[model samples]
Target: EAHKSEIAHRFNDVGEEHFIGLVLITFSQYLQKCPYEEHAKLVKEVTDLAKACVADESAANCDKSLHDIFGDKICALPSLRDTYGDVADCCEKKEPERNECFLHHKDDKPDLPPFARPEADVLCKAFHDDEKAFFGHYLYEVARRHPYFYAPELLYYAQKYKAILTECCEAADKGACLTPKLDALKEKALISAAQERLRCASIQKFGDRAYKAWALVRLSQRFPKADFTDISKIVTDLTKVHKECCHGDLLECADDRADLAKYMCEHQETISSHLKECCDKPILEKAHCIYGLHNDETPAGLPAVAEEFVEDKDVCKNYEEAKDLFLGKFLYEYSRRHPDYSVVLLLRLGKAYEATLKKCCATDDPHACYAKVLDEFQPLVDEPKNLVKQNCELYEQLGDYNFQNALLVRYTKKVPQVSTPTLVEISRSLGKVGSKCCKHPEAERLPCVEDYLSVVLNRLCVLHEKTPVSEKVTKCCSESLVDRRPCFSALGPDETYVPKEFNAETFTFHADICTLPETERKIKKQTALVELVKHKPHATNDQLKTVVGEFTALLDKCCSAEDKEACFAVEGPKLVESSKATLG
Candidate 1:
């Protein structure tokens, strides 16, 4: 009768965890009787043996050292050291079998730290024979299936194993390391861990297994109908299990949830009465129940009920229907206890997605939806760093294009200089454009229409400043007849503003430098007034670049003396290069 269960028939009576744990504990207990001096001696012997091999110069001498180190052990364990060379002589041998040799000997003799030390020695020897590549699989299994099952410790060891992987990956990247065996080893480790996880999941309750499988199924089902095959398979398997259990009846479980529900409902009143009398409490003793459902042999209401056809009922549909709320509420909480679930990854991905969509909505879902065309694009920009930094370029390009096209119409207009006396002229032009187009309005997107002429002009000047005097970058700006259009507003209810446009110069400065000898191409601190006056006569991009170069050169050399003194002296509003103006 005791031999009936599957676990007992498979491996020793205990399950994998308990079995492995007992093996380790029993082994350690037996080893405790061995003198500590014996392990110390073994370590010393191994150390000295490696050192002697390191010192040998000749191929034959190294071979002798390897043979000498193995001594009687070689004959006892031939597979361990038999891969490359003959037993006695050193010559132009094919290679060393350090890993096999270590494997043979370690397995033959157990050591103090049964888990960590021997494996480390194996990897060390593997490295000695250019075999460092084959270590991950061994370490992965050793860490994952340790008898005691300390989760944090296991995760820590997993990370350590990954660090060793870094060396192989780096070597592979450099094209210097080639380890097919090691690659296979890495796959082995992952498969081993997966097997271990599956084993762990098996120990949990049937309901738990059902719920977890259901959650995964739900996630898959959410995809478009075209991609439901994989999900359907999961549903089929879960359905089979449910039916075999007779709707969770441990005895005759089956994939027949619907039939089970019908059968249970037919006998619902009898079962409900049976449950009510079996418990030593009130019919509905909510405080004594988990999730307010009594699975105790005796309770008022039956737990795990097949749902009635109530509106908005919680149906135990195939896992697809219950995935998010169930997995998110349960299994996720369980798996994340190990720390690799990446709560941060989920949070950031969700935030970036929501923030982006919200900005898109704010822009009236603009086709261009670029920064220039919409102010809301700023926050949505992706600047994730390290792993997340991939989005940085995406958002930056949006910012660039938005700057280019969103303000195109407003920036095309030319601004004129406004004197205090001609405030009326400024006022009239602004009236024509509307208050929203007002120069330097609080809501400038990219071109910020108010200063587009000067800003773009100065950028050209800056470019000229970098060029040789003979070939300074030229400027190009001709104000347009176009009027500033409707202004944008961020607040929802009042999503529009009055804009005004004045002569770009009306809001700005003017400079002239006739005496400046050579214009150089470089960034220039060209003020709105100086650029406006320099361009009093419209100039092409090339001509503007030259003037900007010359003007900047003059200002740089002239301002060195009285650093803060104005480089362009103004006499009755007639501004000129220092040499052209009377010292005022």
Candidate 2:
């Protein structure tokens, strides 16, 4: 609700999309919770209303339009007279100030009790007294307390809720049947509530909520021209695919991502030109081209200094006034803008600050004490900074295509048992990290690569335990999978593969080199060097670099000639003699 654009100016520092999005989502869910029936239609109505509001040419005007529209809906729900009044009190504030006022109005106390349960006897009385109001009350009861409940769950509850009431209402002993089923429902809801608490804990413990904000911010960044609702669709679809793909099926994950790519491309309006070039490519290169695209550079003017937020005095006032909204947005704002840093780092810092402020707010010398926290945040900042530096440097040197090509060559040699097609997809997955992170300025670079790259690693580790790999690969995999990406990073070449004796035949190039794009040409060049590396496992790092450098010089000379295939004949033999001397 705080992110809702109706509450626009409050958090518009990022973009209005997530704000409008959060509000629209809350309203639709609010309607979904309403038991007066027309559940789908009301959701659609709210959706249409918000979509139109977002279409308003002036964003500020659209924000106002939405609140006025949303305000009527609030007023209609007499059950929330308290919320209605609070909203109206904010309404009395000038429209410019109104959005900010809405959330803070009930800052000291929750607007409604989360634990309140409607009495079963009173519920029966309501049914006997007035059937229409009875259904509304119960559905309202469920939604009122459990704002975390999603649309589909709310809809199921509405339907089942209606069924139970109708079926029991017709019976001779209404209370007997009603009591048993509501009891069943209470058991179900209790379990659901318990599960939701655990989910919230995980979201908070890890940075999933911040993850969502980063996701929202990214979509807004990449497709600047697309409508808010269009971006919303992309994130929602991707989230669903991410969950389904999470269940240890790498092949299924590949297909689903391709499907998402297909779906995103199919709807041309939602995309502006960032991906249009990829969309134009042939089907064979389409997914590869799209997946290898770089992340949009970090947004300008964001703070890079550690002291900007730390050692500040507003910590307690903002923490109390806004609470979780403040905390979540702090992570969101910091993570989204600074995509180079890991959410874990920002989240860890926030936890320290949150814990400090909780006590410091009441402390006689809290700001002075909180100022001392700079030391605490320093180590969290330091370790990741160094780690991120190396990842970024590797990415900067390799560039996106080479980075991917390197993975392609390495994985093929190292995990030769995996089919070529699967290895290509996996390499592309690893390549996505370089595409995203390398473009970021120094401060932001490290976190972007590690967290995202780890996600790809995680899929592999959970990927069938029986999936065969080298002892070293398993040795790295056996460590805490959370740290598995860097663990695997620490390894040298695959120990299992035996080196082939020097082969002059491997240096042979084809006419294909002349016709290929520079990207493909460079790829072939790297493949040749990497192939050489695989064969000469005993070779030192200096010897490996020499081969790639020598081969690179001769390939360019050969490809430069008018008759390139014939050109290879001259440089090729001399290189063969030279390579023989070096490798031996």
Number of the top TM-score candidate? 2
Clashing pairs in 2: 3-19, 4-19, 5-19, 5-20, 340-444, 342-447
Candidate 2 lDDT, 402-452, residue by residue in tens? 667667666656654443334555576677667666787776576666666
Q: Write the per-residue lDDT of candidate 1 for residues 119-165, one digit (tens) a residue.
A: 33345455555432233333233532332122222333344444554
> Poorest 10 consecutive residues of model 1 by lDDT?
481-490
Cα-based TM-score, every candidate: 0.19, 0.35
lDDT of 1 at 514: 31
Which stretches of candidate 1 lie above 4 Å from their native place?
1-8, 11-180, 187-215, 218-584
Deviation in angstroms for 149 in model 2? 28
Q: Clash totals for all models, in order?
A: 63, 6
